[PDB]
């Protein structure tokens with residue numbers, strides 16, 4: 001089990017760790033988060049009590065380094081940083097464990113939620129979407145735009161998601177215009193899966209990462225990417241049977257986890273109704289359709 | 301974006317543009333089968349592609365063979381239209397290609413956008429105008445060439461005849477849309493008005509009769525009377 005220690009908590013802040021969250025008061029004696037499961041990526045995120053504007057946070061994998069949080073009073077945010085001195089970090093983390101000034105990652109034993117939301121997410125792919133090569137962890141916030149959003153502004157602070165555009169020459173073979181627009185299988189299977197992502201695991205990883213940035217940061221371009229990647233599968237008549245089964249599981253746990261009160265802004269009525277009721281795959285997402293109908297029957 | 305009454309003079313500026321109407325592409329007669337079921341029989345159709353400034357009409361005749369063995373023909377018809385319009389644009393020299401294409405029905409937007417991906421600078425627009433171009437097949441010489449076709453064929457017409465020698469494009473378009481609106485609302489009466497006087501003929505190389513300016517004013521008034529009359533017969537007013 002790994003640990004993310006904090007220098008201090010000088011400003012009152014709501015701290016998220018994966019799907020959990022807790023409040024810390026101004027100058028409360030808080031030194032961090034312990035018992036973080038090894039084997040998964042994680043995200044530690046922040047919303048300041050005094051300016052709910054800008055949720056921000058850090059994707060990280062504890063197997064890649066020892067990471068700590070230090071408040072920067074100049075830039076005004078909790079920053080993640082790496083400590084290279086292993087001896088000292090373990091000593092610092094041991095002292096705080098002894099003085100019980102850390103919250104425990106509160107994983108219920110029966111609970112596979114986080115695994116099910118991050119099954120295909122890999123820190124190496126995150127770092128290609130979020131380009132900042134000097135750090136092993138990745139910063140995301142509410143306001144960051146995507147490469148596709150910029151095409152339609154600072155490129156160093158963008159989310160480099162894979163561009164999906166259904167009315168593009170990449171998506172449409174010359175002389176297959178109707179065929180390829182109405183059945184997107186060539187774009188899904190040849191262009192994106194064989195061509196760009198190489199396999200469905202990388203595709204699902206980006207899909208899952210886009211959803212999580214949408215949910216945890218209210219990042220609008222991430223929400224766009226998540227829906228686009230769902231729509232491309234739902235709108236393909238020919239999808240490997242194992243991808244459809246896995247997609248149904250992925251979406252089920254995403255819909256299960258979404259706050260009930262954020263559905264209005266994180267769920268696109270058109271995509272979901274198309275995917276569940278009109279599309280080629282309308283009969284292939286049984287788990288997802290059941291949870292959507294029972295939890296968000298208004299959207300549909 | 302969309303084309304309406306606030307930007308109507310745009311149609312007659314010097315940016316090349318075409319209206320595309322797909323109403324008459326897929327045409328059928330519905331009939332009873334021997335078993336008493338219902339079946340359709342396709343008949344020849346046409347794409348109506350019109351330059352509103354010049355009157356140049358590119359009439360692509362859609363022969364019934366194009367539907368053979370195909371499914372979902374009303375959806376295919378939109379994509380076949382888009383394919384044929386795209387092929388027309390590619391066939392034109394660069395300086396004759398449109399800068400905008402206005403579709404009369406919003407369902408043509410995506411088919412045409414997809415077929416025109418190679419032309420990102422050509423704007424594809426809908427319109428809020430309810431234009432009467434479906435009545436093109438009430439012009440006898442256009443109906444004749446469509447019904448006689450035994451194969452796909454493109455035929456070029458000027459739908460304004462020689463009117464632009466005497467009137468502006470704006471007025472010529474207004475006359476055309478009045479004539480077509482009348483033919484759409486009551487075809488028999490409209491054609492009666494157009495041909496009642498045998499001394500006024502249709503030149504071999506024209507679509508409409510050779511009316512003088514005075515006679516066109518009278519014709520135009522009769523067509524508005526007809527349209528108002530039908531509106532009254534329809535709504536009892």
Ligand SMILES: N#CC[C@@H](N)c1ccccc1
Nearest residue numbers: 005006007068083089092
């Ligand atoms: N390790 C380490 C680095 C040091 N800056 C520090 C001090 C207290 C709490 C967390 C980190």
